[PDB]
RNA sequence: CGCACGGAGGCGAAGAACCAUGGAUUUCCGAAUGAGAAUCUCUAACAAUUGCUUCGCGCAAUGAGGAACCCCGAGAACUGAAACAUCUCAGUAUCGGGAGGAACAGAAAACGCAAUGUGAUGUCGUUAGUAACCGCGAGUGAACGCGAUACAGCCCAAACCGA
């Protein structure tokens, strides 16, 4: 298929988002990504 | 059209706003079909003009039969903007009356009885 | 910080402009050396270097230019 | 307004076109075109820029890959700052 | 004496007798081929617009809008109905021609405002009305102490609303006593049931 | 120096943080309005419909949103009647159009405790499950008046004038 620069941004988005809750944040808090997606297993939009 | 019955040479018409103007100047005239149609009935008028490029007609088609019931003479005039320009306004008027000529009792005279024999 | 309002205000409509040009300088120099993962880093610096910007850009605007 | 040029690129493939290729990458803004990215990096630099090549990147921003003249040299140039 | 305008009254007494007669039978000619809502620069019935609130001033516009005559022009039912509602024939709107045609000119002069309108004949097929608009963003009217009052916010798109002189009497609220008890202050409030 | 208790570093007596009011900034798509498009692109733009008019987009208007409430139109059936067609559910559900901070109504071609009487309109209590409707079955169902709340009355068309 052939992606536009619109739909590039957004799948350039949602790889972002697929990081991890970074280490500093859980000493920061005291002591989970809700948002973890697959490229197999889940479905993104379009 | 509907209330005009007969046709008016170019040359009369002339004659008839010439004589007005000098009315309006002399002695007096009515501007405007409600203070027209109250001088018929009144009976002041002497003579009284009617454009026909008037529409609605509904603003004029009581003149020529009111007219014959009171003895008033009327005159036909092509445009409606001749007709006020001659009485003097900026703007025209549907219907003029002569209320009491001046300096034109003998024009005046001789326009209702040109027209009288027009039919 | 570094930076006062009233200072900026002292300045003239050229100056600002030229302290403008400056200050955008030297923060894409640091956002060079962050690029090549630099270590001699001052996270408050790069962070003023950001909002005296706004303040030079913000009184430009109330002395019109 | 938006600037055009957002950072240099410092990677190793830009390291080698640098020595090998005098080219210089940058990190510049996906509304900018080749001819923009061209002028800036002339007035930032100061140097005769040649040919540029973009690339609109999966990281939702644009690469421009700005060849330098013989007259400059990139290592040079990246180097300083 | 009489005034001019109770000339133009009279006669549209009888739309079918006297000179009256001839000229509708012309006009129709030229309203027939002209469109649905027809901007005009001087009403048909001057006594009538006058007394409606028609003043020869900026910002006041007239316009004539032909509707089809006849009931409702209602579709079958499609699915289950008991015979009471089955009906297509004898089905009327309970909305009036009149406030039809009010409704097709507001539409086409979107920042005007219904003032009233008069009916100015019919043929075999359609009726013709004169609506009267005013634009209330023109400050001729603003100052005018006889208009000015439609200019007002509460005022905006009255017609779609029944605010309308023929609105008002469509909805059932001539009379003041006897017979209106479903009617005032509204039908909706009333549970609709007139 | 947000939630968020890290690391590094920074800011604050040039009175910061924090709060109140006012202002600056405010990408793209969006009524979306130059034209096209799955938030982008292509070569100046109130697109479209209107009013005024210097008849030039020159001055203006409309468009879309909002928890419900409000007003004007379109209008079911399950159900009840121990079946069912009128009736009932109900002018309900749902659909189209539109206004406001509230809407709508409103200064008698009224009422009709018939009077030598009342005196704009809403609404609340009552009148009353009364009058009236109805396979006179099941069911349906007001008002005048009264006690309260709040109160406020006015402008045109025409006559006679005629710029
Ligand atoms: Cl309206
Ligand atoms: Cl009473
Ligand atoms: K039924
Ligand atoms: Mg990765
Ligand atoms: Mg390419
Ligand atoms: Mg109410
Ligand atoms: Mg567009
Ligand atoms: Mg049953
Ligand atoms: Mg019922
Ligand atoms: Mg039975
Ligand atoms: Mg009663
Ligand atoms: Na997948
Ligand atoms: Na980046
Ligand atoms: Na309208
Ligand atoms: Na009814
Ligand atoms: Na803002
Ligand atoms: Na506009
Ligand atoms: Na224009
Ligand atoms: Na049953
Ligand atoms: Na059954
Ligand atoms: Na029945």
Known sequence: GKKSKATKKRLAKLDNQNSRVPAWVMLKTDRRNHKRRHWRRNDTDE | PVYVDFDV??????????????????????????????????????????????????????????????????????????????????????????????????????????????? | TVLHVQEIRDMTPAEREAELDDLKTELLNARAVQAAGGAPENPGRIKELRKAIARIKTIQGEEGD | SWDVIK???????????????????????????????????????????????TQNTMDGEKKAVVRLSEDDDAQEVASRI | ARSAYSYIRDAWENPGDGQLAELQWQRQQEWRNEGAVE???????????????????????????????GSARKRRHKAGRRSKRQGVTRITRRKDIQRVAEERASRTFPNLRVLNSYSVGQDGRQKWHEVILIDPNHPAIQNDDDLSWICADDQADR?????????????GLSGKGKGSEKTRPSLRSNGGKA
């Open chain 2, 9 to 119: 040479p170019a040359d009369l018409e002339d004659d008839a706003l010439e004589a007005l103007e000098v009315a309006r100047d002399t002695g007096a005239v009515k501007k405007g079909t409600n203070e027209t149609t109250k001088s018929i009935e009144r009976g002041s008028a002497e003579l009284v003009f009617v454009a026909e490029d008037v529409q609605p007609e509904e603003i004029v088609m009581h003149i020529p039969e009111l007219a014959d019931e009171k003895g008033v003479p009327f005159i036909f005039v092509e445009q409606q903007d001749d007709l006020g320009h001659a009485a003097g306004l900026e703007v025209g008027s549907a219907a003029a009356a002569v209320t009491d000529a001046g300096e034109a009792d003998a024009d005046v005279e001789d326009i209702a009885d040109k027209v009288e024999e027009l039919r």
């Open chain 4, 7 to 53: 950072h240099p690129h410092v990677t190793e493939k830009a390291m080698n076109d640098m020595d090998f290729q005098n080219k210089l990458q940058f990190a510049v803004d996906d509304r900018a075109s080749k001819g923009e990215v061209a002028d800036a990096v002339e007035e930032q630099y100061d140097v005769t820029v040649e040919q540029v090549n």
């Open chain 5, 39 to 69: 901007r005009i620069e001087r009403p048909t019935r001057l006594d009538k617009a006058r007394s409606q609130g028609y003043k020869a001033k900026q910002g006041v516009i007239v316009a004539r809008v032909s509707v089809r005559k």
């Open chain 5, 159 to 171: 017609v779609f609303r029944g605010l309308t002189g023929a609105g008002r009497r469509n909805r």
